[PDB]
Amino acid sequence: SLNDKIVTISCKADTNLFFYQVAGNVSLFQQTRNYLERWRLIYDSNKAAYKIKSMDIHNTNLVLTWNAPTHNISTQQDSNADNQYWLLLKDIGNNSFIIASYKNPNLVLYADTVARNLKLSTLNNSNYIKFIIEDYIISDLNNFTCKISPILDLNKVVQQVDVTNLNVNLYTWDYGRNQKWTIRYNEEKAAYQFFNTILSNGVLTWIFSNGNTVRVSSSNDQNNDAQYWLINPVSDTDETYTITNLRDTTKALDLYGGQTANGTAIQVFNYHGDDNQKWNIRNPP
Amino acid sequence: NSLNDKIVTISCKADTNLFFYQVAGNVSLFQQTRNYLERWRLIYDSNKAAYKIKSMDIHNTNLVLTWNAPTHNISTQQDSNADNQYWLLLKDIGNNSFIIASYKNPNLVLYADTVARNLKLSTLNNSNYIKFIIEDYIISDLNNFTCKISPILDLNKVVQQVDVTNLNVNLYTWDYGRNQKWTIRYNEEKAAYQFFNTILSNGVLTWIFSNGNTVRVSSSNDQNNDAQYWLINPVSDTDETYTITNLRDTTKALDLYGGQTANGTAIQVFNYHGDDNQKWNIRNPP
Amino acid sequence: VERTFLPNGNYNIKSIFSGSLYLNPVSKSLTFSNESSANNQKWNVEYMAENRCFKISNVAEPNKYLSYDNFGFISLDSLSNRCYWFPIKIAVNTYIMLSLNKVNELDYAWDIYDTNENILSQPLLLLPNFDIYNSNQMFKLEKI
Ligand SMILES: OC[C@H]1O[C@@H](O)[C@H](O)[C@@H](O)[C@H]1O
Ligand SMILES: OC[C@H]1O[C@@H](O)[C@H](O)[C@@H](O)[C@H]1O
């Protein structure tokens, strides 16, 4: 289930620190939202263990390696060796992972947060050996405050009109709080909510009782799947996504007619994957 | 927290036919019994992020899996909420097994001695002797179980396929025929069950939804038909009584037509109300 | 003068898994490596009368003693109560090496992990001891 999954790995002892790779050196670094902190989990069924492979673009064959017998962890060339395999033990009820060496299961990864690197330790109850393994998309987007542009024009953004006008349309980027959205991943529903920053509990919502209309509404309406979305990456792109509603996953966030003029409606429409249904979720500059 | 208060059986990855067995403070490894002697409640402490493993013994009602420090021995002792009575359930992802480490000393984990047929604590390795299968006790009891199914309105009658060529399903007096016996199999992916009639190889109990409420036996090589799958829910206070609802529409329960008990009475599905004609006893064939 | 079952002096330290691998420091860890005939594979064993234990120092680094860290590894550090070892002689010169101190209110001992009796590149650890039958906790001290 984790095989071939690209993930980020962060520390339970410090959730702001992520496994970071450069030129064979593994360290703990703040969130970069890029390939430097992305890892592919490669499952070997015979071993019941995983290789943890760097998604580095320059060096494409680096895996998390225990420099046995030393206390040091690095990324070395994949030679499918025992010191390059790891047991991924999920601590149930705690939603964290213990990462034990296949070469010596007595030894598990230990997060040295003050030295900002990794080492090894026998098992204990400290958070320093517990890690948060998360799908990289979720890792990047969760609690990310963003602006959302259609690819048809990256100079415009999806916005709530104002604090009282809850309609959602396309408009030129003016750095307004009504033009920014804080994305939150709902673990239970396995979906996302877009919180407009001009409000406190206002989320992007498909008004299904009014056809294809989408507007912002309160998030204290608890059980409405129209308030939740699925964000799926477009291949070959770093920031482009398709956004589909949880009530009906065939309903995708759609730029009305593909029109780019100011005040153009933002709606949902039957998914076909056209350019007016692709969006760039970006850092507000 | 997703395992809190769950009642489970625990068996060995090294020998899936051996289960954690409890009696009078003694813990051993024993063949499947499908009863409380091999059932355990997982009790979660959020602060410790660890679990107590409480025996479902009906006589002694406060016994929990206990590490006899400083020895490597394991037993069940009165629950005093002690560190040597708490355990880390570490799920080996992709392997569908658990390593069960002592909360008191996580250097040590449960180790199955399948020749002495008991448990001890050990340091870690890559063998299956420190890996365990933790499963919901209903699933554990019902998975791969060959049974007969009777309405509670009359336990002398059973749900049966008419014969090898006649795939219809009706109520009839038990006669020990293979057409009257079913092998239950749990589907991990679908989280639902299939009832394989033992007179056929690939014949399963199926809601023929294109024909109203009719249920019949059909081939299981029809892959993606939720109507072939069922949820089996225990009735409270009972050891063998279940309601059986269809995966396609969970409001559709296995139903004894009119509550009639005569031979040849139709077995169907119907809107669930929980009446006695929708309650079934899944039992060992004598 | 002899006070015990194990005379003072220089030893080689081996695991029972291998008669050709020798205990030496590598970085901050201890491991069993190919014979080097160097001082770093020579260990000075000294009996301590007051506590009836042994302290074991590396001949190449005479002020460094076998100890343990807070991560389960055997280490080479300056003198402290973690450097005191309580051997259990189970054969001719085969010993189990217990820490003098109870660790986590248990007996803890030198432990070398094996993969089908192969210990190459394995660090020496300090793990719980329950008896005298754990092959991974059996070590040979050879006077040399
Ligand atoms: O809803 C009106 C429609 O207008 C079309 O031009 C556009 O391609 C569709 O995605 C939809 O927006
Ligand atoms: O569809 C026939 C129905 O007959 C009724 O008498 C009974 O209450 C239902 O459960 C169902 O069996």
Author numbering:
A (entry chain B): 10 to 294
B (entry chain A): 9 to 294
C (entry chain C): 3 to 146
Sentences from the paper on this structure:
Here, we report the complete structure of a bimodular ∼760 kDa BoNT/A large progenitor toxin complex (L-PTC), which is composed of BoNT and four non-toxic bacterial proteins. We found that L-PTC/A consists of two structurally and functionally independent sub-complexes, the M-PTC and the HA complex. The HA complex is composed of HA70, HA17, and HA33 in a 3∶3∶6 stoichiometry and adopts an extended three-blade architecture, whereas the M-PTC is situated on top of the HA complex platform. BoNT/A absorption is mainly mediated by nine glycan-binding sites on the HA complex that together form multivalent interactions with host carbohydrate receptors on intestinal epithelial cells.
We also determined the crystal structures of the HA17–HA33 complex bound with Gal, Lac, or LacNAc. All three bind to an identical site in HA33, where the HA33–glycan interactions are mediated only by the Gal moiety through extensive hydrogen bonding and a crucial stacking interaction between Phe278 and the hexose ring of Gal. The HA33–Gal interaction is well-defined and identical for the two HA33 molecules in one asymmetric unit (AU). To further confirm the structural findings, we mutated the Gal-binding residues in HA33 (e.g., D263A or F278A) and found that these mutations almost completely abrogated the Lac binding. Gal binds at an equivalent site in HA33 of L-PTC/C (HA33-C) but with ∼15-fold lower binding affinity than with HA33-A, which is likely caused by the replacement of Phe278 in HA33-A with Asp271 in HA33-C. In addition, HA33-C binds Neu5Ac in an adjacent binding site. However, HA33-A does not bind Neu5Ac-containing sugars because the key Neu5Ac-binding residues in HA33-C, Trp176 and Arg183, are replaced in HA33-A with Tyr180 and Asn187, respectively. These differences between HA33-A and HA33-C indicate that the known host susceptibility to different BoNT serotypes may be determined in part by the interaction between HA33 and host glycan receptors.
